Amino acid sequence: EVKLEESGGGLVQPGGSMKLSCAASGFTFSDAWMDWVRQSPEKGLEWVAQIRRKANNHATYYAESVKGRFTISRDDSKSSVYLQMNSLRAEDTGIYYCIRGMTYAMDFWGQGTSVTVS
Amino acid sequence: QIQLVQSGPELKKPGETVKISCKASGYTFTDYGLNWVKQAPGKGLKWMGWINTYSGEPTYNDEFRGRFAFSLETSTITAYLKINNLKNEDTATYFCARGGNWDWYFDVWGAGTTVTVSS
Amino acid sequence: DIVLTQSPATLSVTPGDNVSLSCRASQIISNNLHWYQQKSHESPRLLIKYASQSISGIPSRFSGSGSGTDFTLSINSVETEDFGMYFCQQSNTWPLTCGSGTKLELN
Amino acid sequence: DIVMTQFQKFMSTSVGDRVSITCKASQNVRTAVAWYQQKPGQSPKAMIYLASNRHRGVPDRFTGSGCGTDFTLTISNVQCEDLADYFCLQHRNYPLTFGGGTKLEIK
Amino acid sequence: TNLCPFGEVFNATRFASVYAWNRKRISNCVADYSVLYNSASFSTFKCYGVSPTKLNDLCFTNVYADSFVIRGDEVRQIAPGQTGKIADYNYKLPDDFTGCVIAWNSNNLDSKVGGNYNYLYRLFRKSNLKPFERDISTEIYQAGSTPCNGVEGFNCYFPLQSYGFQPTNGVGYQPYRVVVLSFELLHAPATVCG
Ligand SMILES: *[C@@H]1O[C@H](CO)[C@@H](O[C@@H]2O[C@H](CO)[C@@H](O[C@@H]3O[C@H](CO)[C@@H](O)[C@H](O)[C@@H]3O)[C@H](O)[C@H]2NC(C)=O)[C@H](O)[C@H]1NC(C)=O
């Protein structure tokens, strides 16, 4: 059994800050590169951030529109990947999916969490 | 505890059918095969043939092509060895040994049932 | 079938001696040979798997060697516990078969 | 950056038929594209990784192929189960971009 | 007057996996393929360029014997002209082939109740394979843009993904042992005939 679940479902006024918490289960959590995608009816599917496995220094890569506002960090002993977003705007509405490993096998996806600005 | 215990020594007549047993426990029975070994008094060993412990499909050393059958009961863990048309040839001890489905070396053995034939 | 001659037919050893057995095959079997000891009328046991490795529990004075067609089982510093009869048995082509065996006794 | 073009937004073929969704690109994405099925109300599942291989647990009707720039995903005898939307995702440069999307309804 | 070692390569215990297939050179003996054809155990016996009944009276020059293990639905690709992830990443036959392709259904041997995953097969490569060319090199295949230090992770995958052979796994996925011969009839005197 492998399953993932997110957190941080709330409304913030534009300019806030809220950290999403994605917990994992039932696999070798050490060597797995876990990303975050963005779903919105205006933008379609985009891509948000990515952190890599232990053998690659826990590196990070960001999209060109969330540079310097979107910090993602993991700790394998606590078995979760945390996406931290600050200085939020109006275009960052949508539903975020925390997935297991993109563009290969073991490509499991979560269920989602909506974050919308009033 | 990995061991292969069997039934007792058998005493039959030429023309009868015997059925000796080989019951295993302690390991997962479906991860390995079963190889039956006939040892004549004072000679080497002849691999009688191997039976898969999942489907009951036998495979014989084609020297022993007729008169022998390797049964298999799966729930009550047992492999039988039936011998038709007993002769003065067929007196020997009969082990059973667990040689794997990928390696084929007989590590776990059994005490052996001496089948003796005379009138 | 592959016949496995063994030489000599029987030995004679004293405790504290080192004698090397031999199991010459017929074809070219690539280290697919194992070695079995067997005492008087009981179940045999393994000594070496794939002609060079070693199994658990046994002493470390049973060292196998050789590859290709010629194989050697080197028994070293033999105690009284290693009296018995020794077998070799290939695993490469079908049908599998054990050897004609060498009987190891004590002087 | 790399933008994938997926200009079919509505495709409609009935049961037991064949339809192909194509994903045009803009740069030399060699073989590193992926195909994603999303039934409505759920998360987008995974169909094809590295543009020709297939996941486990998915039926054998999903055969996607192509190299160079322009890929396609050809389904065979589409049932009523496969009423879903099909995204194509490339991974060559680090700003990954998903395609447009193609929603399917049956006659 | 010595019979060929078709006994050895056929009823062998472990066939080598398809990413490194063993190449047994057979020469200077007498062949008899009537013990091959008349045995009805072989599911597939296709000969390209020689008739199967005519296999006896043919003085060859040298006969090779490739041998490997593949799954059921991929035995179709062992033929001149097809493609797939066996025929161009693991074992490629030329389109002038003059041999025979023999198969089995070895679900009795190479199938453990858990996973008998010791039969590896290649999945990724930078290009295609030449006719009759193996590649035992296990190099971390990149797929994007970065050269990744010999480290697995994103866009860098191990090429040899293994098989999986359950006994109840389906007929198109059961392990099929394949031995394919490759004859040759020119530029040498007669060596193999019988
Ligand atoms: C690989 O090994 C198998 C044994 O497991 C060989 O099959 C057996 O081959 C022998 C000798 O060719 C056959 O014995 C002959 O049987 C006929 C009657 O059918 C008899 O007239 C002969 O005197 C001799 O006893 C045996 O039937 C055959 N068994 C089976 C099940 O096929 C096999 O030939 C070996 N492979 C190759 C390529 O040689």
XYZ file of C-alpha atoms and ligand atoms in Angstrom:
684
model
C 0.000 0.000 0.000
C 1.246 3.452 -1.017
C -0.755 6.658 -0.601
C -0.105 10.376 -0.282
C -2.117 13.145 1.350
C -1.656 16.906 1.406
C -2.602 19.684 3.818
C -2.976 23.442 4.042
C -6.416 24.015 2.575
C -7.340 27.605 3.254
C -8.043 31.056 1.911
C -5.468 33.825 2.353
C -5.652 37.466 1.368
C -3.129 38.378 -1.380
C 0.285 38.752 0.202
C -0.038 36.027 2.834
C 1.972 32.898 3.542
C 0.959 29.259 4.017
C 2.971 26.038 3.996
C 1.586 22.878 2.404
C 2.357 19.562 4.100
C 2.415 16.360 2.044
C 2.880 13.104 3.959
C 3.845 9.806 2.343
C 3.550 6.138 3.241
C 4.492 2.650 2.210
C 7.586 3.034 0.048
C 11.305 3.715 0.270
C 10.973 7.424 1.027
C 14.725 8.074 0.798
C 15.385 7.653 -2.941
C 12.353 9.297 -4.527
C 12.169 12.693 -6.244
C 8.892 14.364 -5.288
C 7.409 17.303 -7.219
C 4.335 19.567 -7.091
C 2.010 20.411 -9.991
C -0.641 23.103 -10.321
C -4.185 22.679 -11.639
C -6.427 25.638 -12.405
C -9.263 26.111 -14.921
C -7.588 29.253 -16.302
C -3.997 28.061 -16.659
C -4.449 24.338 -17.250
C -1.670 22.218 -15.781
C 1.564 23.928 -14.776
C 4.531 22.869 -12.705
C 5.644 24.374 -9.413
C 8.738 22.919 -7.759
C 10.818 19.763 -7.363
C 13.154 18.305 -4.755
C 15.346 15.317 -5.551
C 16.549 12.222 -3.715
C 19.270 11.830 -1.089
C 22.017 10.931 -3.573
C 21.694 14.344 -5.281
C 22.254 16.653 -2.270
C 18.481 17.340 -1.956
C 18.696 19.810 -4.825
C 15.862 22.068 -5.900
C 14.430 23.508 -9.115
C 11.684 26.114 -9.505
C 9.450 27.442 -12.233
C 10.149 30.896 -13.629
C 7.070 32.461 -11.996
C 7.585 31.238 -8.427
C 11.285 32.091 -8.023
C 12.209 33.263 -4.541
C 8.694 32.837 -3.157
C 8.312 29.032 -3.052
C 10.683 27.017 -0.842
C 10.372 23.216 -0.813
C 12.256 21.058 1.684
C 11.986 17.494 2.955
C 13.146 15.390 5.895
C 13.038 11.648 5.259
C 12.950 10.647 8.936
C 9.650 12.526 9.362
C 8.406 11.101 6.016
C 7.005 14.263 4.465
C 7.725 16.884 1.813
C 6.841 20.455 2.761
C 6.182 23.218 0.236
C 6.458 26.696 1.766
C 4.951 29.606 -0.177
C 5.338 33.264 0.771
C 4.224 36.538 -0.879
C 1.239 34.931 -2.592
C -0.627 36.605 -5.453
C -3.830 36.215 -7.456
C -2.423 33.835 -10.090
C -1.396 31.245 -7.477
C -4.966 30.032 -7.054
C -5.708 26.443 -7.918
C -5.293 22.899 -6.656
C -1.808 21.549 -5.940
C -0.897 17.871 -6.301
C 1.988 16.292 -4.384
C 3.220 13.380 -6.483
C 5.674 10.558 -5.876
C 8.050 10.556 -8.824
C 7.367 12.247 -12.129
C 8.054 11.006 -15.672
C 9.114 7.481 -14.694
C 7.598 4.487 -12.938
C 6.209 4.717 -9.392
C 4.364 7.765 -10.733
C 1.776 8.028 -8.003
C -0.283 11.174 -7.512
C -2.037 12.578 -4.473
C -5.570 13.917 -4.311
C -5.127 17.659 -4.058
C -5.570 20.746 -1.904
C -7.128 24.008 -3.056
C -5.555 27.342 -2.166
C -7.480 30.399 -3.311
C -6.987 34.116 -2.671
C -9.906 36.444 -1.903
C 12.997 -25.900 11.596
C 13.658 -27.047 8.025
C 13.481 -30.823 7.697
C 11.917 -33.394 5.378
C 10.482 -36.363 7.276
C 9.120 -39.429 5.519
C 7.232 -42.664 6.144
C 8.562 -46.037 7.206
C 10.438 -48.869 5.554
C 8.358 -50.855 3.095
C 8.237 -54.588 2.359
C 6.407 -55.543 -0.833
C 6.057 -58.397 -3.329
C 7.011 -58.446 -7.046
C 3.896 -57.197 -8.810
C 2.618 -54.848 -6.094
C 2.503 -51.056 -5.974
C 4.101 -49.105 -3.131
C 3.587 -45.461 -2.197
C 6.233 -43.745 -0.085
C 5.809 -40.255 1.335
C 7.863 -37.084 1.803
C 6.293 -34.357 3.959
C 7.980 -30.986 4.469
C 7.312 -28.103 6.840
C 9.103 -25.074 8.229
C 9.721 -23.323 4.912
C 7.435 -21.986 2.208
C 6.884 -25.133 0.137
C 6.299 -23.306 -3.147
C 9.682 -21.537 -3.323
C 11.602 -24.736 -4.175
C 11.167 -27.988 -6.056
C 11.596 -31.568 -4.892
C 14.171 -34.010 -6.248
C 13.835 -37.729 -5.546
C 17.038 -39.740 -5.206
C 17.457 -43.515 -5.439
C 20.516 -45.047 -3.775
C 21.250 -48.695 -4.448
C 23.210 -50.577 -1.749
C 26.873 -49.800 -2.305
C 26.642 -47.471 -5.309
C 26.250 -43.772 -6.082
C 23.070 -41.751 -6.377
C 20.749 -41.522 -9.367
C 18.526 -38.446 -9.559
C 15.097 -39.966 -10.197
C 13.522 -36.718 -11.308
C 12.169 -33.448 -10.072
C 8.566 -32.424 -9.409
C 7.437 -28.812 -9.247
C 5.766 -28.035 -5.929
C 3.196 -25.641 -7.338
C 1.356 -27.391 -10.173
C 2.195 -31.044 -9.609
C 3.885 -31.351 -12.999
C 6.445 -34.184 -12.838
C 9.663 -34.512 -14.808
C 11.549 -37.794 -14.922
C 15.079 -38.864 -15.521
C 14.277 -40.708 -18.732
C 16.092 -43.790 -17.508
C 13.141 -44.040 -15.100
C 10.597 -43.305 -17.808
C 7.802 -45.765 -17.010
C 6.479 -47.347 -13.791
C 7.166 -44.252 -11.624
C 4.864 -41.378 -10.718
C 5.385 -38.337 -8.493
C 2.080 -37.345 -6.948
C 1.561 -34.070 -5.122
C -0.974 -33.032 -2.492
C -0.743 -29.309 -1.859
C -2.784 -28.586 1.289
C -1.521 -31.629 3.175
C 2.097 -31.074 2.134
C 3.230 -34.414 0.658
C 4.921 -35.760 -2.482
C 4.226 -39.434 -3.158
C 6.341 -41.799 -5.265
C 4.369 -44.679 -6.776
C 6.221 -47.715 -8.146
C 4.392 -50.027 -10.543
C 5.592 -53.540 -11.478
C 8.139 -54.161 -8.746
C 11.051 -56.354 -9.814
C 14.228 -57.768 -8.312
C 15.934 -54.651 -9.710
C 14.121 -52.050 -7.655
C 15.414 -52.681 -4.131
C 17.135 -49.501 -2.908
C 16.810 -46.650 -0.440
C 14.763 -43.672 -1.634
C 15.461 -40.186 -0.288
C 13.724 -36.948 -1.095
C 15.676 -33.743 -1.351
C 14.811 -30.089 -1.820
C 16.736 -28.695 -4.788
C 15.600 -25.270 -5.853
C 13.807 -23.966 -8.904
C 16.874 -21.943 -9.912
C 19.969 -23.514 -8.296
C 19.606 -27.346 -8.203
C 21.810 -28.431 -5.368
C 20.143 -30.764 -2.899
C 20.759 -29.158 0.478
C 17.864 -30.362 2.660
C 17.499 -34.136 2.628
C 15.416 -36.841 4.258
C 15.945 -39.996 6.265
C 15.174 -42.355 3.387
C 12.794 -45.316 3.142
C 14.418 -48.637 2.341
C 12.139 -50.514 -0.062
C 13.044 -54.210 -0.111
C 11.700 -56.749 -2.612
C 11.871 -60.537 -2.244
C 9.430 -63.424 -2.267
C 24.341 -37.737 -19.589
C 27.618 -36.497 -18.120
C 29.671 -39.159 -16.364
C 31.738 -38.019 -13.380
C 34.738 -40.227 -12.708
C 36.486 -39.767 -9.370
C 39.988 -40.804 -8.410
C 41.002 -42.864 -6.562
C 38.203 -45.278 -5.652
C 39.130 -45.211 -1.957
C 41.744 -43.421 0.137
C 43.535 -43.975 3.424
C 44.377 -41.010 5.623
C 45.642 -40.215 9.125
C 44.400 -37.283 11.254
C 46.517 -34.199 10.664
C 47.003 -34.871 6.947
C 45.955 -33.017 3.795
C 44.745 -35.005 0.782
C 43.126 -33.557 -2.320
C 40.215 -35.310 -4.005
C 39.317 -34.970 -7.684
C 36.123 -35.137 -9.758
C 36.934 -35.031 -13.469
C 33.825 -34.421 -15.550
C 33.253 -35.390 -19.181
C 31.980 -32.212 -20.858
C 33.022 -28.633 -20.074
C 30.775 -27.612 -17.181
C 31.395 -24.065 -15.962
C 31.699 -24.508 -12.148
C 28.261 -26.091 -11.857
C 29.538 -28.932 -9.662
C 28.792 -29.489 -5.975
C 30.342 -31.795 -3.384
C 28.484 -34.056 -0.944
C 29.754 -36.041 2.000
C 27.803 -39.001 3.316
C 28.534 -41.218 6.289
C 27.308 -44.793 6.700
C 23.650 -45.144 5.532
C 22.157 -41.766 6.375
C 21.238 -38.531 4.645
C 24.097 -36.739 2.857
C 24.961 -33.081 3.366
C 26.518 -30.293 1.320
C 30.094 -29.128 1.613
C 30.576 -26.585 -1.199
C 28.099 -25.013 -3.616
C 29.213 -24.161 -7.178
C 32.637 -25.742 -6.543
C 34.258 -22.769 -4.788
C 31.805 -21.096 -2.377
C 30.956 -22.196 1.160
C 27.775 -22.832 3.119
C 27.036 -21.967 6.733
C 27.584 -24.197 9.763
C 30.221 -26.502 8.235
C 33.922 -26.178 9.170
C 36.164 -23.845 7.204
C 38.646 -26.649 6.486
C 36.571 -27.780 3.474
C 37.859 -25.559 0.675
C 36.839 -26.267 -2.895
C 38.704 -25.124 -5.977
C 39.028 -25.781 -9.693
C 36.974 -24.848 -12.743
C 36.403 -26.156 -16.240
C 36.361 -29.953 -16.373
C 38.759 -30.781 -13.501
C 37.702 -30.088 -9.920
C 39.421 -30.575 -6.565
C 37.969 -30.725 -3.060
C 40.817 -29.973 -0.673
C 40.262 -31.430 2.792
C 42.685 -29.953 5.338
C 43.597 -31.038 8.897
C 41.077 -33.860 8.851
C 39.553 -34.983 12.149
C 37.810 -38.257 12.992
C 34.503 -36.561 12.131
C 35.334 -36.589 8.393
C 35.490 -40.344 7.930
C 32.865 -41.287 5.369
C 32.109 -41.376 1.657
C 32.308 -38.301 -0.577
C 30.225 -37.493 -3.659
C 30.408 -35.004 -6.507
C 27.393 -34.015 -8.574
C 27.002 -31.697 -11.529
C 24.118 -29.333 -12.217
C 24.755 -27.976 -15.714
C 23.114 -30.228 -18.288
C 20.244 -32.619 -17.859
C 19.776 -35.093 -16.314
C 21.588 -34.260 -13.075
C 23.728 -37.021 -11.648
C 25.987 -37.707 -8.714
C 29.359 -39.396 -8.962
C 30.724 -42.843 -8.306
C 32.303 -41.583 -5.091
C 35.530 -41.992 -3.120
C 35.502 -43.757 0.244
C 37.616 -41.956 2.847
C 38.642 -44.141 5.781
C 41.235 -43.892 8.557
C 44.566 -45.691 8.945
C 10.934 27.901 -22.832
C 9.525 24.645 -24.199
C 5.794 24.915 -24.881
C 3.800 21.868 -25.933
C 0.933 22.429 -28.347
C -2.153 20.259 -27.890
C -4.840 21.893 -30.008
C -7.479 19.150 -29.900
C -9.810 20.224 -27.120
C -12.841 18.100 -28.060
C -12.549 14.652 -29.626
C -15.492 12.283 -29.997
C -15.428 8.690 -31.223
C -17.837 5.975 -30.100
C -17.293 2.557 -28.531
C -14.956 0.159 -30.309
C -13.245 2.805 -32.431
C -9.867 4.521 -32.823
C -8.773 8.109 -32.207
C -5.323 9.653 -31.815
C -4.321 12.687 -29.752
C -1.181 14.493 -30.913
C 1.187 16.682 -28.876
C 3.273 19.108 -30.933
C 6.413 20.601 -29.398
C 8.739 23.554 -29.936
C 12.272 22.235 -29.321
C 14.291 19.029 -29.500
C 12.605 17.019 -26.764
C 14.171 13.714 -27.697
C 12.148 10.927 -26.101
C 11.325 12.416 -22.711
C 7.598 13.079 -22.863
C 4.884 11.535 -20.714
C 1.153 10.967 -21.171
C -1.377 11.449 -18.382
C -5.017 10.353 -18.149
C -7.347 12.243 -15.805
C -10.810 10.963 -15.126
C -12.936 13.874 -13.838
C -13.010 14.503 -10.104
C -9.760 12.630 -9.445
C -6.046 13.008 -9.827
C -4.391 12.619 -13.249
C -3.013 9.097 -13.469
C 0.023 7.924 -15.404
C -0.130 6.165 -18.779
C 3.133 6.438 -20.755
C 6.637 7.228 -19.509
C 9.489 8.141 -21.882
C 7.108 8.278 -24.857
C 6.826 4.568 -25.639
C 6.908 2.461 -22.455
C 3.826 1.486 -20.491
C 2.969 1.444 -16.807
C 1.796 -1.597 -14.878
C -1.897 -2.154 -14.243
C -2.960 -0.228 -17.363
C -4.588 -2.125 -20.278
C -2.780 -2.857 -23.525
C -4.910 -0.541 -25.660
C -2.810 2.482 -24.656
C 0.062 2.421 -27.158
C 1.766 5.806 -27.439
C 4.800 6.378 -29.622
C 6.824 8.953 -31.504
C 10.196 10.672 -31.361
C 11.780 13.860 -32.617
C 9.369 16.626 -31.625
C 5.803 15.489 -32.340
C 4.355 12.574 -30.355
C 0.974 10.862 -30.383
C -1.097 8.485 -28.258
C -3.236 5.998 -30.184
C -5.984 4.158 -28.317
C -7.700 1.057 -29.665
C -11.388 0.067 -29.186
C -12.095 2.810 -26.662
C -14.718 1.768 -24.117
C -17.024 3.833 -21.927
C -14.380 3.602 -19.184
C -11.944 5.882 -21.033
C -14.133 9.004 -20.977
C -11.286 11.155 -19.671
C -8.849 13.954 -20.487
C -5.351 13.298 -21.790
C -2.405 15.556 -20.914
C 1.062 15.309 -22.468
C 4.012 16.330 -20.293
C 7.590 16.839 -21.476
C 10.751 16.653 -19.397
C 13.754 18.051 -21.252
C 14.491 21.431 -19.667
C 13.771 22.253 -16.080
C 10.726 24.520 -16.572
C 8.539 21.487 -17.308
C 5.404 22.325 -19.242
C 2.211 20.356 -19.695
C 0.195 20.358 -22.879
C -3.255 21.788 -23.326
C -5.608 18.912 -22.635
C -8.140 16.967 -24.693
C -11.490 15.989 -23.211
C -13.372 13.038 -24.653
C -17.077 12.242 -24.916
C -18.770 9.305 -26.588
C -21.495 9.275 -29.242
C 31.262 -39.509 -37.013
C 30.743 -37.715 -33.687
C 27.280 -36.274 -33.160
C 26.925 -32.531 -32.597
C 26.359 -30.897 -29.165
C 22.750 -30.001 -29.797
C 22.274 -32.081 -26.683
C 24.148 -29.498 -24.637
C 22.510 -26.234 -25.662
C 18.943 -27.549 -25.613
C 18.364 -29.323 -22.280
C 20.588 -26.963 -20.283
C 19.702 -25.759 -16.805
C 20.083 -21.969 -16.948
C 19.751 -20.152 -20.239
C 21.492 -16.802 -20.165
C 19.310 -13.708 -19.995
C 18.632 -11.870 -23.215
C 20.871 -8.839 -22.637
C 23.893 -11.195 -22.643
C 23.128 -14.251 -24.784
C 25.666 -17.053 -24.967
C 27.135 -17.795 -28.396
C 28.025 -21.474 -28.760
C 30.098 -22.199 -31.848
C 29.238 -25.642 -33.251
C 31.555 -27.090 -35.874
C 33.147 -30.315 -37.120
C 30.414 -32.803 -36.224
C 27.397 -34.497 -37.798
C 23.990 -32.882 -37.324
C 20.597 -34.595 -37.165
C 17.671 -32.190 -36.819
C 15.046 -34.952 -36.922
C 15.355 -35.181 -33.143
C 14.624 -31.451 -33.154
C 11.654 -31.235 -35.500
C 9.754 -34.417 -34.633
C 9.699 -33.619 -30.915
C 6.372 -31.831 -30.506
C 7.409 -29.865 -27.418
C 8.619 -26.869 -29.447
C 5.835 -24.310 -29.787
C 7.590 -22.356 -32.552
C 9.937 -23.760 -35.203
C 10.397 -21.288 -38.061
C 13.238 -21.606 -40.562
C 14.022 -18.668 -42.846
C 15.840 -19.496 -46.053
C 16.054 -23.273 -45.585
C 13.122 -25.658 -45.679
C 12.624 -27.511 -42.369
C 12.253 -30.921 -44.008
C 15.387 -30.191 -46.045
C 17.547 -29.534 -42.965
C 19.478 -32.804 -43.185
C 21.332 -32.948 -46.520
C 23.045 -29.569 -46.306
C 26.811 -29.319 -45.864
C 27.297 -26.123 -43.872
C 30.420 -24.167 -43.009
C 29.657 -23.232 -39.400
C 26.469 -23.285 -37.342
C 26.078 -20.970 -34.356
C 23.485 -21.249 -31.600
C 22.213 -18.123 -29.862
C 20.092 -18.821 -26.798
C 18.195 -16.625 -24.351
C 14.942 -16.229 -22.386
C 12.137 -13.827 -23.336
C 8.502 -13.390 -22.384
C 5.637 -14.779 -24.441
C 4.356 -11.891 -26.546
C 7.903 -10.820 -27.493
C 8.889 -14.073 -29.225
C 7.305 -12.595 -32.360
C 10.189 -10.117 -32.660
C 12.831 -12.857 -33.129
C 12.474 -12.732 -36.914
C 13.984 -10.620 -39.722
C 12.405 -7.178 -39.925
C 10.367 -6.554 -36.784
C 10.987 -4.011 -34.045
C 10.180 -3.583 -30.373
C 12.105 -3.474 -27.108
C 13.609 -6.904 -27.696
C 14.585 -6.875 -31.355
C 16.496 -3.587 -31.384
C 17.652 -3.113 -27.788
C 18.564 -6.710 -26.876
C 19.028 -8.999 -29.908
C 18.871 -7.953 -33.572
C 18.712 -10.417 -36.517
C 19.822 -9.297 -39.987
C 17.419 -9.154 -42.909
C 19.277 -11.874 -44.781
C 18.836 -14.506 -42.060
C 19.464 -18.139 -42.995
C 18.824 -20.036 -39.754
C 15.985 -21.361 -37.632
C 14.154 -20.042 -34.561
C 13.120 -22.575 -31.911
C 11.055 -21.825 -28.807
C 9.451 -23.401 -25.735
C 6.979 -22.794 -22.967
C 9.290 -23.009 -19.963
C 6.805 -22.017 -17.311
C 7.822 -25.126 -15.375
C 11.403 -23.966 -14.739
C 11.884 -20.197 -14.875
C 8.917 -19.199 -12.726
C 8.909 -18.918 -8.939
C 5.735 -18.225 -6.970
C 7.124 -14.905 -5.799
C 9.331 -13.163 -8.321
C 11.907 -15.105 -10.342
C 13.411 -11.860 -11.566
C 16.908 -13.115 -12.428
C 16.282 -12.745 -16.189
C 17.258 -9.159 -16.956
C 16.540 -7.385 -20.226
C 17.686 -4.070 -21.652
C 15.238 -1.200 -21.990
C 17.094 1.980 -22.996
C 19.900 2.833 -25.397
C 21.245 5.835 -27.261
C 20.723 4.170 -30.662
C 19.642 0.865 -32.184
C 21.571 -2.399 -32.339
C 23.618 -3.801 -35.193
C 22.798 -7.236 -36.622
C 24.245 -9.885 -34.258
C 25.676 -7.558 -31.619
C 25.291 -7.812 -27.845
C 25.774 -5.005 -25.337
C 26.635 -6.018 -21.766
C 27.502 -2.417 -20.845
C 25.387 -1.166 -17.929
C 25.639 2.607 -18.324
C 23.310 5.059 -16.579
C 21.188 6.292 -19.492
C 20.327 9.966 -19.346
C 17.173 11.265 -20.988
C 17.126 15.044 -20.551
C 20.007 17.499 -20.645
C 22.242 17.016 -17.629
C 25.149 14.543 -17.454
C 24.453 13.071 -14.053
C 27.709 11.903 -12.467
C 26.934 8.184 -12.619
C 24.153 8.747 -10.068
C 20.601 7.468 -10.368
C 17.683 9.813 -9.856
C 15.785 12.171 -12.137
C 16.283 11.691 -15.905
C 18.930 8.996 -15.250
C 17.691 5.422 -15.205
C 19.290 2.008 -14.972
C 18.953 0.349 -18.399
C 18.425 -3.275 -17.328
C 14.952 -3.446 -15.827
C 14.236 -7.025 -14.840
C 11.453 -9.453 -15.728
C 8.860 -11.004 -13.459
C 7.603 -14.574 -13.879
C 4.721 -15.761 -11.749
C 3.257 -19.210 -12.525
C -0.222 -17.645 -12.887
C 0.943 -14.600 -14.817
C -0.673 -15.143 -18.223
C 0.282 -17.004 -21.394
C 1.484 -13.922 -23.262
C 3.837 -13.145 -20.351
C 5.123 -16.647 -19.502
C 8.893 -17.259 -19.904
C 9.765 -18.690 -23.317
C 13.228 -20.145 -23.742
C 14.455 -19.444 -27.263
C 17.363 -21.068 -29.060
C 18.021 -19.652 -32.527
C 20.543 -21.251 -34.872
C 22.314 -19.322 -37.624
C 23.685 -21.332 -40.532
C 26.224 -20.347 -43.180
C 26.842 -22.019 -46.535
C 29.618 -20.158 -48.388
C 33.363 -19.466 -48.602
C 34.465 -22.641 -46.797
C 34.532 -26.404 -47.366
C 32.063 -28.822 -45.792
C 32.254 -29.151 -42.005
C 28.775 -29.858 -40.575
C 26.544 -32.360 -42.370
C 24.581 -35.463 -41.451
C 17.652 -33.393 -23.608
O 17.414 -34.388 -22.618
C 16.215 -35.154 -22.792
C 16.088 -36.026 -21.562
O 15.501 -35.319 -20.479
C 16.306 -35.931 -24.102
O 15.076 -36.600 -24.362
C 15.237 -38.036 -24.515
O 16.238 -38.384 -25.470
C 16.473 -39.801 -25.525
C 17.591 -40.014 -26.515
O 17.342 -39.320 -27.730
C 15.197 -40.565 -25.895
O 15.444 -41.940 -25.623
C 15.064 -42.786 -26.724
O 13.674 -43.104 -26.698
C 13.214 -43.880 -27.835
C 11.715 -44.071 -27.703
O 11.086 -42.804 -27.829
C 13.987 -45.226 -27.895
O 13.678 -45.884 -29.111
C 15.519 -44.996 -27.796
O 16.199 -46.244 -27.702
C 15.893 -44.078 -26.635
O 15.569 -44.787 -25.457
C 13.993 -40.126 -25.065
O 12.796 -40.617 -25.655
C 13.898 -38.606 -24.962
N 12.835 -38.223 -24.050
C 12.010 -37.199 -24.284
C 10.970 -36.943 -23.238
O 12.104 -36.507 -25.290
C 16.555 -34.967 -25.254
O 16.786 -35.714 -26.441
C 17.753 -34.050 -24.991
N 17.839 -33.034 -26.025
C 18.472 -33.223 -27.186
C 18.454 -32.070 -28.139
O 19.034 -34.278 -27.453
